[model samples]
Target: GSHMPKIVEVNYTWATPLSYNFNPNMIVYHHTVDNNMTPQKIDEIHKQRGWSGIGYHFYIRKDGTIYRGRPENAVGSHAPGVNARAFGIASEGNFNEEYVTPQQMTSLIALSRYLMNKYNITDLKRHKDVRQTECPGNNFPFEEIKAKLNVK
Candidate 1:
């Protein structure tokens, strides 16, 4: 069994009553595009986009620090169609320009496995897999991470 990473609580204040009831069947991974992004910064950015709050359920820092974004049950704005049926995890970095750090990948795998087991989710997808953008990036190591999580 993999060890869970230390998750820090941001407890973000949403602009609206952002709560939902749904069973997730998929997990979506994304890249923050900027390595220096903090939870506060992400919240502000999401607000600028006219969203309730940060679009992801979790955010992983370069040092493997995990922070809560939206509630797990809430509908995330990170992805379309499946926003109500999936969890979104954003890692801090432009993977198109670089690779994720070892620490970050370690934390991601732990969290992904935990969520997969808890929710009985079988689908592990990159942000680009659902959309027409290079979201998690071409260098995000999707296959490696999926294998680590034992997801097809």
Candidate 2:
């Protein structure tokens, strides 16, 4: 059995009240692109950058910590249009420049599995899949994660 990491306490704040129920049919993975590695720094960047809200529903740190951005049972501000139905999760570093650490991947897989099971999410799309964005980087563990998933 795979060892699960403890859910890290994210030091960030939400712009909008995630007080509504959610119907997550899909999960979207993304990359920060920049070096805003910490959840607090990410949130600060999002807020000060003039965006309406935080883009991702969750932020994975380099040290294998999972920070909750938007609540699982609410709409995310990451993906537009389908934001209400899709959940967004962004990793800390640039995958194209550096490979994701095993610890980070382990924590991500554990959290993703939990979200998939909880929301009945059948679709897993990387950020680049939605639009012409270079998000989630080119080195995302799509195949490895796919193999770990019990997708029906």
Candidate 3:
């Protein structure tokens, strides 16, 4: 494996590690409400949101570094209903309210494709697709990413 960048430098406070084995059926995307927050801050928010730690399996920062949120082999608390069936990825931006960078999107595509290939995932969807909310935000380049990936 190659040395990839991680947005946050994890310290591993919890003794009991999270379970990594999941069904990995599809990709679920989300955005961080606080666009200015760092990966560490994002983790704090996840903890405050009533989770053990950061919930997404992987996180992409505003700078495009892919951070380790939950272990890949385990399920995350990102989306309650799709926890076990999908791999969650939350980007660092208020996409519903603001725009994300080209670099960030590129990083997301690469990171997502890598995970999809690894876990046998075939589809991708915005968090709003399943729920009745404008998640991944209004400013997200949905068509751009889809066209770039040529995803159905």
Candidate 4:
């Protein structure tokens, strides 16, 4: 409803209209390996890698603007092991090298809270939680965000 964050809708031509999951129980956060990225750019990369389209369900820019990556209920290609059971959100920039912006963090918290409340989801995780490599990344305020989310 009105509780959700403002997200820019993008119309992507998905190669396959499959992998839809209506009830995601977890949220997986990520950061684009590169500092520069757009949903369209990511779609291109995912297509090249032989996926349906963009790997994430949401893309958050440094300005705190959120983009709808793939369909909200569709399975994401972002995480390998948990792609089907979770929603993947990629914040702009490689968190390993650059710190996230205040705006991005604000949007991240709002969106995450809304998602958790809406989906009745309690599990929030970083990319590395289920696989290898640092994502959403080393500089991201993981603990801070988690604590904030814990507030009722």
Deviating ranges (above 4 Å) for candidate 2: 1-5, 11-13, 16-21, 49-53
lDDT of 2: 0.75
Clashes of each: 0, 1, 7, 0
Summing lDDT over every window of 10 consecutive residues in candidate 4, give the lowest-scoring window.
Answer: 16-25
Candidates sorted by TM-score, descending order? 1, 4, 3, 2
How displaced is residue 2 in candidate 3, in Å?
11
Over 15-95, each residue of candidate 2 has an lDDT whose tens digit, in order, gives 645645667788888878776566767777777865435667788878777887765566667776678778888888888
What would the TM-score be for candidate 2 when compared with the true structure?
Answer: 0.84
Model 3 clash tally, residue pairs = 7
lDDT of each: 0.87, 0.75, 0.75, 0.87
Q: 1-152, model 1: which lDDT tens digit per residue? A: 54455778896778977859756899999999987889989999999998998999999999988898888778888998889888999999999998999989998988888788778888988888898888998799899997876766
TM-score of each: 0.94, 0.84, 0.86, 0.94
Clashing residue pairs in candidate 1, if any? none
Ten-residue stretch with the least lDDT total in model 2: 1-10
Off by over 4 Å in 4: none
* Shift of residue 147 alpha carbon in model 1, Å: 1.2
Instruction: Report the C-alpha displacement of residue 63, candidate 4, in angstroms.
Output: 0.7
- At residue 140, give the lDDT of candidate 2: 83
